[PDB]
Structure 1
Amino acid sequence: MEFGFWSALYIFVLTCFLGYELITRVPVILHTPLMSGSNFIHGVVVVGAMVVLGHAETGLEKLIGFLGVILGAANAAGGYAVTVRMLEMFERKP
Structure 2
Amino acid sequence: MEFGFWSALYIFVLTAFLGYELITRVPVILHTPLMSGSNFIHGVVVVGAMVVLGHAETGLEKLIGFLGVILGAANAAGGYAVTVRMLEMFERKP
Same fold, TM exceeding 0.5? Answer: yes
Task: Specify the alignment match of 2:28 in structure 1.
Answer: 28
| 1:91 has 2:91 as partner | yes
Alpha-carbon distance between aligned partners in 2 of 1:20 and 1:93, rounded to the nearest angstrom: 35
CA deviation map 1:47-83 (0-9, x unaligned): 1111110001121000110000000000000100110
Native 8 Å contact 2:40 2:79 kept in 1:
yes
Alpha-carbon distance between aligned partners in 1 of 2:2 and 2:54, rounded to the nearest angstrom: 18
Alpha-carbon distance between aligned partners in 1 of 2:27 and 2:2, rounded to the nearest angstrom: 38
Alpha-carbon distance between aligned partners in 1 of 2:5 and 2:58, rounded to the nearest angstrom: 31
Query: Matched residues, percent identical?
Result: 99
Task: Specify the alignment match of 1:42 in structure 2.
Answer: 42
Alpha-carbon distance between aligned partners in 1 of 2:57 and 2:20, rounded to the nearest angstrom: 40
Gaps of 5+ in 2: none
With 1-10 and 26-35 compared, the bigger mean Cα shift is at: 1-10
Structure with greater proportional helix content: 1
Q: CA RMSD in A?
A: 1.6
Alpha-carbon distance between aligned partners in 1 of 2:21 and 2:11, rounded to the nearest angstrom: 15
TM-score relative to the length of structure 2: 0.95
Task: Return the offset for 1:3.
Answer: 2.0
Alpha-carbon distance between aligned partners in 2 of 1:92 and 1:25, rounded to the nearest angstrom: 26
Task: Return the offset for 1:2.
Answer: 6.3
Native 8 Å contact 2:2 2:9 kept in 1:
no
Q: 1:12 to 1:20 in 2, by over 3 A?
A: same
Q: Which runs of 4+ in 1 moved over 4 A?
A: none
